[PDB]
Design an enzyme around this catalytic site. Structure first.
Site, PDB file in Angstrom:
ATOM      1  N   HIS A 154      28.445  45.251  41.225  1.00 14.53           N
ATOM      2  CA  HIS A 154      28.605  44.429  40.034  1.00 14.53           C
ATOM      3  C   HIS A 154      29.569  45.077  39.041  1.00 14.53           C
ATOM      4  CE1 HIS A 154      26.578  41.669  36.876  1.00 14.53           C
ATOM      5  NE2 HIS A 154      27.603  42.263  36.289  1.00 14.53           N
TER       6      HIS A 154
ATOM      7  N   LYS B 245      38.401  42.646  38.676  1.00 12.28           N
ATOM      8  CA  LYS B 245      38.865  41.345  38.190  1.00 12.28           C
ATOM      9  C   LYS B 245      39.714  41.478  36.942  1.00 12.28           C
ATOM     10  CE  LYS B 245      34.860  39.179  37.845  1.00 12.28           C
ATOM     11  NZ  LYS B 245      33.938  38.068  37.420  1.00 12.28           N
ATOM     12  N   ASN B 246      39.289  42.330  36.008  1.00 10.12           N
ATOM     13  CA  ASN B 246      40.058  42.505  34.782  1.00 10.12           C
ATOM     14  C   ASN B 246      41.375  43.206  35.097  1.00 10.12           C
ATOM     15  OD1 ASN B 246      37.990  41.401  33.134  1.00 10.12           O
ATOM     16  ND2 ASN B 246      36.941  43.381  33.042  1.00 10.12           N
TER      17      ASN B 246
END
Lengths: 357, 357
Positions: free
Chosen positions: A226, A233-234
């Protein structure tokens, strides 16, 4: 009509933080769920009560809101759901069975606490505004509330998962680089779908005490996943969007280091960077709401076992994100909030004119 | 017998933070020292009073100590030293002259405040112990006290330096890489003397908006020098000592990045790193005392003009130190503490049982 009574009773107790070593024990391979049942029967009520007691002790508007009062009502249900076993006895291969069924049921009931609580935040912004003091109060409360939840879900997951190599959600031989690859793969997939382009990955590990041995640790792989997925993603989006007028998109580099007490994972991108002032807001629930909480919640998962998650970029160049975890199962112990007179005064802020000018 | 009276008077005022743009103004090339005199005549007393008022408002043992009471007595002298000009008039090419003489005199009188205040810290450790609450109180007070001092010395330096290309201690065209080289050279010199070995230096700049143009900024080069020298010394020692059984000592790499609002300097070494838990203590005055304060004070110099200084290492590999400065002279404004009811309660900590367990 006895919910208030219970909350008042169990809130007098302090939750009991468990070490990663203890989890392995109660998990073992045969360790009877009987011990778990007797333990969970008391602990869960203690944890629920503490957080509920803290909730009931904040501004009436935050309480009267549909969301907070709504999740509060979910916790009330769950508290009762468990009381039912205080005067029950093991041995009955049924008493235990219906307990899990009760836990599983409690889990689904709470499956949307994050989105919901997140909804109260937006309502608050539109209803009262986004002043620094409100930010502080919300930040303080939500970190504790969400951390409290992570732990309760932890206990519940270990129990349900085990009682019907891996000790539930815990992997005593988790290979960090492998989880890094998985998180990257998923992020890349989504990156290609939306941007039709994505940077590559480079991984490097430094096993200080044992040069070429792969790095392993005792941890909860889904927790690590997680955190890493959020960061990838960022880092991908920033790298992609900052090079839409260029052609050489650079790679995301990750370093996994194992020292005497820390296991560190640094993710470096060249996504353009962010000014220092905006970094601070990236972790605020309030300042990151509209019209997500990936980062602040990811940080809570790091802090849960005494770790941390930090960011530092160089505006105009890129950003380094680092996840700090405890290398030894010994130092890996639950980080749990507790309702005290200590906690009470963090909500007494009456800001109006600082100590700096 | 009127010191208490003054302190009570000027402490009712708030110091006036100046922008880097304003400093250039009052400095100019001809701007009459008359304006400076009339301004400094009021501001200096205001700044002294504020910090003195805060001092007199902390535990009697900290006050009764020879050090604190000693520096306190130095500030009392200086306060008086300046009052002498409140009822004086410019025009007299003498009134002004004796003012500088007074400033220069005040400067030498305070030349040892750091070592002295540092002495009170050690005395406190041996006299009362090193508990978290004491740490907090000392940390809170010393950051403000030292920041207050940096600003007072700033004003004094600008005045004395100018009134008899560079506007005093400020360089409107400071070339960052150059100051980096100077700080490195000095550190290398000392490194070779003590260790008879030292890592090399690599510098790289990223001028986001203007690719090959050297990076310049409006700043106080001696301030930047101090910060960088402290960092190089730590990075050299760690690199040297961590490779005393190896032969390839690696280089210290520095990146200077200029973005839309930040000018960032990152110093990366491979000196072995430090566990996360010890990083936190590196900035504590108390926890870094024996039997120096380079880092915590260096951080104050960064914060003085709205910047920051941060550290993050990877235990078993190395450490990145980053200095964040404001790129624009517009956002570069003094960061000054002020005595309020706000500041008062930071000393009301009555710790005894936390909110986490």
């Amino acid at each position: 009509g006895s919910a208030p009574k219970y909350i008042e009773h169990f809130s007098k107790f302090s939750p009991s933080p468990l070490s990663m070593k203890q989890f392995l024990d109660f998990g073992s391979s045969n360790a009877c769920e009987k011990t778990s049942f007797t333990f969970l029967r008391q602990e869960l009520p203690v944890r629920l009560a503490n957080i509920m007691k803290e909730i009931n002790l904040l501004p009436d508007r935050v309480l009267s809101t549909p969301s907070v009062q709504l999740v509060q009502s979910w916790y009330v249900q769950s508290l009762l759901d468990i009381m039912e076993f205080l005067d029950k006895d093991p041995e009955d291969h049924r008493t235990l069975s219906q307990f899990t069924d009760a836990l599983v049921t409690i889990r689904n009931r709470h499956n949307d606490v994050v989105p919901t609580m997140a909804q109260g935040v937006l309502e608050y912004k539109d209803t009262y505004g986004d002043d620094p003091v409100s930010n502080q109060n919300i930040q303080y409360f939500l970190d504790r509330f969400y951390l409290s939840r992570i732990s309760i879900r932890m206990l519940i997951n270990q129990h349900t998962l085990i009682f019907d190599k891996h000790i539930g959600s815990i992997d005593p031989n988790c290979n960090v680089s492998e989880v890094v690859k998985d998180a990257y793969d998923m992020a890349k997939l989504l990156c290609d779908k939306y941007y039709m382009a994505s940077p590559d990955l480079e991984i490097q590990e430094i096993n200080a005490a044992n040069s070429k041995q792969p790095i392993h640790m005792v941890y909860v792989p889904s927790h690590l996943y997680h955190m890493l997925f959020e960061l990838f993603k960022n880092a991908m989006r920033a790298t992609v969007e900052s090079h839409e007028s260029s052609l050489i998109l650079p790679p995301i580099k990750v370093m996994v280091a194992l020292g005497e007490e820390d296991l560190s994972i640094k993710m470096s991108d060249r996504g353009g960077g962010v000014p220092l002032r905006k970094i601070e807001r990236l972790f605020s629930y309030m300042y990151s709401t509209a019209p997500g909480y990936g980062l602040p919640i990811s940080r809570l998962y790091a802090k849960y076992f005494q770790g941390d998650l930090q960011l530092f970029s160089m505006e105009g160049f890129g950003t380094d994100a680092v996840i700090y975890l405890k290398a030894l199962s010994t130092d890996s112990v639950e980080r749990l909030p507790v309702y005290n007179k200590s906690a009470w005064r963090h909500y007494q802020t009456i800001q109006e004119a600082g100590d700096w000018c």
